């Protein structure tokens, strides 16, 4: 039974990555939004 659950302990060490993927979305959006907004700043002059 301990081995059965020793394996589960590793199964659980194996959500952070999906948040990491999200981290990159956060980065891309803000980076590109700054460019979109500067393009808007000119359009809005």
């Amino acid at each position: 039974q301990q081995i059965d659950q020793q394996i589960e302990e590793e199964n659980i060490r194996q959500q952070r990555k999906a948040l990491q993927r999200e981290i990159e979305d956060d980065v891309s959006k803000q980076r590109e939004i700054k460019g979109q907004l500067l393009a808007e700043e000119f359009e809005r002059e």
Binding site: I3, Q6, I7, E10
Partner: peptide, 23 residues
Amino acid sequence: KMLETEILKEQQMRDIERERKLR
């Protein structure tokens, strides 16, 4: 005596098995 032997040795397989599960 041989049974306690074989058991105490056998258990170390179980600890190698732990090493094997870690791989």
